[PDB]
Amino acid sequence: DDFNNILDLLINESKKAAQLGDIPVSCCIIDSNNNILSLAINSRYKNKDISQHAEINVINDLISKLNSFNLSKYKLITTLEPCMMCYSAIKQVKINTIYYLVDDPKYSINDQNLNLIQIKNQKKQSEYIKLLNIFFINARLEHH
Amino acid sequence: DDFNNILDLLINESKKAAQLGDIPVSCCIIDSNNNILSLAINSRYKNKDISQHAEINVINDLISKLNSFNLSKYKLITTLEPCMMCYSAIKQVKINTIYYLVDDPKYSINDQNLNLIQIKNQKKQSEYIKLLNIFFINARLEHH
Ligand SMILES: [Cl-]
Numbered sequence: 057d058d059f060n061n062i063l064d065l066l067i068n069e070s071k072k073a074a075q076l077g078d079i080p081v082s083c084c085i086i087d088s089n090n091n092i093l094s095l096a097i098n099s100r101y102k103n104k105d106i107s108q109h110a111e112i113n114v115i116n117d118l119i120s121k122l123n124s125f126n127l128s129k130y131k132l133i134t135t136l137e138p139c140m141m142c143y144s145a146i147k148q149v150k151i152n153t154i155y156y157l158v159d160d161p162k163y164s165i166n167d168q169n170l171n172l173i174q175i176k177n178q179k180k181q182s183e184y185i186k187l188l189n190i191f192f193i194n195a196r197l198e199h200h
Numbered sequence: 201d202d203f204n205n206i207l208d209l210l211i212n213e214s215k216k217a218a219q220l221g222d223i224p225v226s227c228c229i230i231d232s233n234n235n236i237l238s239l240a241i242n243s244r245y246k247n248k249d250i251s252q253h254a255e256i257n258v259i260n261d262l263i264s265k266l267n268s269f270n271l272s273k274y275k276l277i278t279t280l281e282p283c284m285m286c287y288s289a290i291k292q293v294k295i296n297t298i299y300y301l302v303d304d305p306k307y308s309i310n311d312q313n314l315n316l317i318q319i320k321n322q323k324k325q326s327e328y329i330k331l332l333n334i335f336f337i338n339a340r341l342e343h344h
């Protein structure tokens with residue numbers, strides 16, 4: 057569909073990540089009934105851990121809850137197209153679908169049982185783009 | 201992935217439909233192991249039946265094989281983006297994924313558990329576009 061309520065929630069969460077120095081990305085994992093089982097934000101720089109993107113964080117939350125590395129029954133929704141580290145972690149726990157809102161400007165993948173699917177929600181996409189733009193502006197100001 | 205072998209097969213089949221007066225569309229339904237369970241071509245005008253597009257034909261083949269209207273365990277691959285009649289029939293048998301090669305130039309859908317996903321296979325897409333173009337050229341020649 058367009059996940060308007062889940063996206064409202066994720067966009068609200070990611071603000072937290074932006075306040076603390078990380079690209080404001082939030083994401084959740086859902087079961088087939090679209091219930092959220094785990095939610096996480098990006099905390100790579102905040103916790104000085106190369107792996108702590110929102111996607112790997114949410115994967116680890118669910119591994120913890122279910123005591124299992126097999127998430128084949130679940131789908132992932134993120135505000136921003138995942139990097140390749142996260143894409144590979146998502147693949148390695150057998151999640152078959154990644155919904156993302158905003159693709160990443162910054163590989164050639166012929167994987168399957170793994171679809172990367174852009175959510176169409178223009179209002180939410182424009183809102184999240186404005187949040188990211190504010191983050192990057194502050195990024196270049198501190199860069200200089 | 202890019203379904204290169206299945207697409208080779210479908211593009212070969214659809215030629216049959218083009219020879220007999222129908223837009224040359226072919227499609228199959230696959231299980232989770234990507235095995236084909238049913239394959240069909242468009243035969244609307246050939247059999248004077250508004251419903252006999254390739255997608256509805258393949259659905260009926262599988263309903264027949266399984267004696268069930270519940271195809272929730274299966275995915276559909278077609279050469280051409282489905283019309284809305286077929287999209288609704290696919291939804292009504294609970295198939296969750298439609299892979300298509302070529303989108304249709306000729307609605308606003310907020311359905312979910314139903315993803316419409318364009319296959320990326322440039323060589324196969326260009327080949328199928330050339331086949332369709334030949335079909336339409338002959339169409340306008342007979343039109344006049
Ligand atoms: Cl890998």
Ligand SMILES: [Cl-]
Pocket residue numbers: 288
């Ligand atoms: Cl309906």
Ligand SMILES: [Zn+2]
Pocket residue numbers: 109111138139140141142143
């Ligand atoms: Zn990442």
Ligand SMILES: [Zn+2]
Pocket residue numbers: 253255282283284285286287
């Ligand atoms: Zn149709």
